[PDB]
Symmetry: C3
Subunit: 217 residues, 3 copies
């Protein structure tokens, strides 16, 4: 239904001790990163937000994070979902803490929101009040600054990003040009917490406007 | 069934009147681009042809044109389809004129055509008699010159492109190396209108030939 | 079930005699690339291995080879599968021999293997004893050198690759970072034949290990 949360799910979790030199080199790991935590899930941008939160709760860095082509609904295998993330830390203890924090966030009630009856249009309008080390690096902002994390399907996102930019004193940090691997689009916007919230609200309203009247021009 | 039109459908259309500077930058718009026209549909190359047609009698530029991964049949949301296009113009009125032209073309009877009994193989063989500003730029020809816009699934397209090039006095301008985002392939060929027509006919026949004997 | 072969299937095969010069240029064909063999199939990495074999068996080069987005299961048309390969040679006969060698290999018993009961996790762990001209070029090794060709879905692959690198005296030549077009991941590793074989076995076991307990420590 409209305004329902689309529930995100974790599919697979694994820890590696004493990562191989070859893999460390290929992943451009820092010397302290001896352990890796792997995770996959069926919702990419929620998971990216979750991994960022994990960098606040534990001594881990996000060293790999990528989306799958055509989204979770089109996965051909059980554990692929639509995202893989890799946390790195000095030992399995730090990594375990980071994975647990990631899991907790994914199960916290955050998620994409449905814009219609059969949940075939949905969006993400998440105000991150304090970034961790991953989304702050992605956006090119100081760790701890706020972000509006806005994602919707391609036309909805372009229309709604424009509305969001006009509604608040925010800057465009990163543009996810359509298509992302999952055939969405969006942006990371920064500003005061107030400004990011205003942008989130305006984005949500604008996506809903297009969902309610897709051919109205 | 074979030779049936695969009807293209427009899914969403919206106009942005006074585009924000932040978006103008990320989209690399020109200073005279004040308004945007957004469109999505369930068939990309038809939409690209329609956008180009819109540039012919309206002051609009195609500033964004991208296809969706794995095509319209694999779309996960209702309005994504398999293409997004953005027109930019001096005003919302002129953008609307541009979109009106685009929509008219998409509904004109152009489209992908089925090559077999269950429509599981299809192709585009469109003679663009007179290009606009978009496809002429893409192919590297003069606005107003002709193109054969040829698209099919990957093996069929390679086989049929060779057939078209042998059949007609045309040059390859742009090659859509397999896979495009939709897992198709094709090319833009240029030449006289009669040569592009001869290319189109030969392409269609060759795609049909492969569909009829894919392992021979 | 676990250890079942996922049978690879060829969907289309065609020969172009005397390719038009216009095509020949865009495909980056060489003066002796006068004719083309085209093949599509529903399994990409087995086809890449097969095309590499063809370069040993016949006077052909692999001039084009790409995977389709989101894999064969999501193909929208009948013949797209998840891979297109193009062989080129001096004559239709050498291309014909090339394609015959490709087809022979694809039906040889090679393939992805299931890691679980419903075959929803699968992997490729192929020891190429002696590379042809295609995979050697891809890996940056000399033709004739051995490779472990390792592919699995993203988490399984990252885990099992790291396991294979620890298990055997191999080096990573090429990393297929997740996602490939098919939403898999893997690598080409080189070393002696026995070492590549050791990496393959280690890769396969590590993928099976994840498949048998996808949620790791959450499940203990
Ligand atoms: Cl674990
Ligand atoms: Na699908
Ligand atoms: Na079974």
């Amino acid at each position: 239904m409209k305004n329902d949360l689309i529930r995100p799910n974790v599919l697979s979790v694994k820890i590696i001790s004493n990562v191989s030199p070859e893999m460390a080199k290929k992943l451009e790991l820092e010397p302290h990163h001896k352990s890796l935590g792997l995770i996959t899930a069926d919702c990419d941008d929620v998971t990216y937000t979750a991994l960022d939160e994990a960098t606040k709760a534990a001594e881990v860095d996000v060293v790999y994070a990528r989306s799958m082509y055509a989204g979770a609904g089109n996965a051909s295998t059980k554990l692929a979902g639509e995202v893989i993330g890799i946390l790195a830390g000095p030992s399995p203890a730090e990594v375990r803490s980071g994975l647990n924090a990631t899991l907790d966030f994914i199960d916290s009630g955050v998620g994409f929101v449905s814009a219609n009856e059969d949940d075939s249009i949905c969006y993400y309008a998440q105000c991150v009040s304090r970034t961790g080390s991953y989304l702050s690096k992605t956006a090119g902002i100081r760790e701890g600054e706020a972000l509006a994390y806005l994602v919707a399907p391609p036309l909805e996102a372009m229309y709604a990003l424009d509305a969001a930019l006009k509604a608040a004193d925010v800057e465009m940090c990163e543009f996810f040009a359509p298509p992302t691997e999952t055939n969405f689009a969006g942006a990371l916007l920064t500003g005061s917490q107030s400004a990011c919230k205003a942008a989130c609200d305006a984005f949500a309203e604008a996506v809903q406007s297009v969902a309610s009247n897709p051919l109205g021009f």
